[PDB]
Design a protein around this ligand. Sequence first.
Ligand SMILES: Cc1ccccc1S(=O)(=O)N(CCN(Cc1cncn1C)c1ccc(C#N)cc1)CC1CCN(C(=O)OC(C)(C)C)CC1
Ligand SMILES: OC[C@H]1O[C@@](CO)(O[C@H]2O[C@H](CO)[C@@H](O)[C@H](O)[C@H]2O)[C@@H](O)[C@@H]1O
Ligand SMILES: [Zn+2]
Lengths: 410, 315
Amino acid sequence: SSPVWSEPLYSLRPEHARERLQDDSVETVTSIEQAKVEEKIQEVFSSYKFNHLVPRLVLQREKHFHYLKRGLRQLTDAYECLDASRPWLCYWILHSLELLDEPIPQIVATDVCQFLELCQSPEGGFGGGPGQYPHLAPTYAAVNALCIIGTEEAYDIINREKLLQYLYSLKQPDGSFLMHVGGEVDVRSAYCAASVASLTNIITPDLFEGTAEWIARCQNWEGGIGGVPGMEAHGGYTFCGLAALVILKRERSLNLKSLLQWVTSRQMRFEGGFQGRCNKLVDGCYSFWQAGLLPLLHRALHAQGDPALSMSHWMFHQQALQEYILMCCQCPAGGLLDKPGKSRDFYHTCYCLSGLSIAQHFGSGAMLHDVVLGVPENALQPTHPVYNIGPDKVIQATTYFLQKPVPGFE
Amino acid sequence: FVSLDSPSYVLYRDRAEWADIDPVPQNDGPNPVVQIIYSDKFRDVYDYFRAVLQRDERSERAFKLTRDAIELNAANYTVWHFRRVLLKSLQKDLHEEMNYITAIIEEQPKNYQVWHHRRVLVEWLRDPSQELEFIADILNQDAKNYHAWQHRQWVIQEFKLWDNELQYVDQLLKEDVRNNSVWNQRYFVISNTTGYNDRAVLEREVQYTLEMIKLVPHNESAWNYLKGILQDRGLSKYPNLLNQLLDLQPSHSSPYLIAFLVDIYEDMLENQCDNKEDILNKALELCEILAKEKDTIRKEYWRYIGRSLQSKHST
Ligand SMILES: Cc1ccccc1S(=O)(=O)N(CCN(Cc1cncn1C)c1ccc(C#N)cc1)CC1CCN(C(=O)OC(C)(C)C)CC1
Ligand SMILES: OC[C@H]1O[C@@](CO)(O[C@H]2O[C@H](CO)[C@@H](O)[C@H](O)[C@H]2O)[C@@H](O)[C@@H]1O
Ligand SMILES: [Zn+2]
């Protein structure tokens, strides 16, 4: 083996060069763009190698922390484009802090609760800011943020009776949900609805009638899931679809074989990160949307008695994903990003870190097996692959709300 | 009337025709979080938007105001919803609104709200006549725009505009045969028109795909489509395909071809093939080659497949 101060990396093996794109001497826009990314990424990988000396990789926790802490209070007018997404900013930042094991001061926690209360609509659900109409996306974010805070004050913000009525007001006869009143339908809504309804204990027998079948119709010939039936398989919508089915305990509605083969194919042989769709570019946020499918698939297959499942690893290259995130997705100023050359944002900070945590931590039954690449301080807190908040927060919230009745229903 | 960037733009708080309504400030609370320090122009428009929203004022002035609010944040779905309430309430010319949404989408083609708004207009008008050409223009700028493809699928299905789509698919595959969105559209068109049960159609599709693979053998999309159109009947139901792939192996032993062979072997074993021990041995050998040499990024998957094969077919 090696001294503790050098750690060989998969992306730096000499044979790794064989993984560069083969364009068959037929150039199209797709291959040209892919080759450009690979060239940049090779330059990055090489910068971490000094012949046989390969220093341990470092997650720049303190830089990320300072960037997050600042964003939680105040933002310049450059963030006007997120004025209808403020609960997202709360969730992305709080979840990142949670992953980094950075405490949330009580005063900050109370202030977040107060703000999310202002975003809650009288009709149920939460909007993108105070006085905005409710929408399933900020509803999901707000509920998750409140669960990360996890105080009785936070839990009780949620108007559960109106929330359930709001979900009903979005439910379509074909099993699908609108994202908001008079809004668009795609598989995001099924996941948002299932996530908030299960956390807050407001699921009725009829709420999700037909929903599992509708999601299954979104799985396509590629094996992944599109936004609506007919559409191209996409890692974000696939995460939504499978996670919703896990909550509904209807994973078997899908062809799990074709799904598994599709998602594992989305890990890039050269970059080590994931792409969102076949023949598109690597992107740090798919470290979560794609890689998070593997723990979901593991649980699903394990529930079916699959005798071949690993007891130690997810079915993707955990080390390679960590290498891509740590070497390519960190902004030296703090924050994380899509790929080298892109600018940081809180969304990529959230999902790059979430994906890193999935890659570091395997658990199934009584078996736990960690693979933390780099210095030991790189270890993040675990994340729940369905909800993407800490598993401790999921248990605490679900336990709290299970003590309350389903609103107006027995 | 006047745009936000125009030299003669005036803040709503300064407009005489708005003097009768008081602006409504956003209350972020006494101790704000994720607080955006808005520009004066942004806050001014949104203070007046909150005012008209609160009063439910269905007016021409409110309608024009939504256009500015949208320019400032086109992801504000509340503004879009209100604009639609006004379109109906004021009986606005929907063809003019179509010209508007056309321009907006060109500017912001990755935004959910703008596409949804367009769909609502087309639904209200029951007029799909501009859609295929408009979408094709958007796709000419980004051939993989997910919103554009989704809207295209909706329009074709809702208004039954199938007649020319395979020709459109063929044109785009000529431009970039690696465009997975276009392979997906190919499946969409065929499954919804002739279907793949017509054995003549399936043969045409298998031939076409094999030709594309020959031209660009490391293009994953064509390989995935080949599997996609055969998998439900079962890869082992196509005995000639195995032979053909086996012939290409020595000269084109890509991970895509080798993976496809394993997929065939998996299905064969599932269907009581002849020479099961032999087929199992060959499949395990390929899984090892994939895991160790040809597709090492997926070592865990290929090891799983090898164990899965043994759990199902060892005897
Ligand atoms: C990933 C995804 C998953 C499912 C459906 C759509 C998408 S996405 O189209 O790529 N898009 C991300 C838009 N994106 C663009 C993007 C992300 N990666 C590359 N790009 C160009 C952003 C978003 C915020 C910020 C910030 N800050 C920067 C870029 C949408 C986001 C919208 C808000 N989200 C969301 O509601 O997620 C649920 C549905 C799982 C609850 C997270 C995804
Ligand atoms: O990935 C294939 C798998 O998906 C399902 C739905 O769960 O069907 C999808 O793919 C079919 C092509 O294989 C399409 O005909 C169908 O429309 C689509 O939903 C399963 O039936 C199939 O095994
Ligand atoms: Zn991204």
